[PDB]
Amino acid sequence: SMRKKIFKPEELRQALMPTLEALYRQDPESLPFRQPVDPQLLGIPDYFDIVKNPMDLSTIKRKLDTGQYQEPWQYVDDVWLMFNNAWLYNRKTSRVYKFCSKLAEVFEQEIDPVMQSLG
Numbered sequence: 001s002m003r004k005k006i007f008k009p010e011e012l013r014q015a016l017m018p019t020l021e022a023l024y025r026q027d028p029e030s031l032p033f034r035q036p037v038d039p040q041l042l043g044i045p046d047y048f049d050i051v052k053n054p055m056d057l058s059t060i061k062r063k064l065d066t067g068q069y070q071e072p073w074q075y076v077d078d079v080w081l082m083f084n085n086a087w088l089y090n091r092k093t094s095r096v097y098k099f100c101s102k103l104a105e106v107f108e109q110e111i112d113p114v115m116q117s118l119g
């Protein structure tokens with residue numbers, strides 16, 4: 001755990017994109033996560049006060065596509081940031097909160113064999 005191997009961006013993309021596609025495939029559950037939260041449109045000006053580091057599927061996709069992840073745990077961390085933001089901000093009865101919980105179920109199943117294979 002002290003030796004950090006090198007990952008090429010195209011390799012990470014090939015390995016990790018199917019786990020992101022698994023999240024996009026969830027419908028309607030991925031719909032609130034396919035674009036960044038817009039607190040102006042949604043009328044929630046306090047959103048950025050509570051959620052200091054916004055994250056969504058389109059941002060994760062862009063970071064994968066543009067080679068911004070150096071290691072696979074940085075991708076896992078962004079996915080979980082998106083989950084934790086939604087669980088922090090939203091009430092437990094809300095569609096977003098429940099949809100988030102479903103995505104986290106899906107993602108944990110998809111990501112496990114991929115992380116084992118990347119090392």
Ligand SMILES: CCc1c(C(=O)N[C@@H]2c3cc(Cl)ccc3CC[C@H]2O)[nH]c(C)c1C(C)=O
Pocket residue numbers: 031032033037038041042044047085086089090095096
């Ligand atoms: C509740 C506002 C919120 C949304 C959101 O996407 N809200 C709308 C929406 C909602 C649903 Cl359930 C389905 C589609 C759409 C598409 C339009 C979109 O504005 N996303 C997140 C992550 C949040 C928060 C604050 O965490």
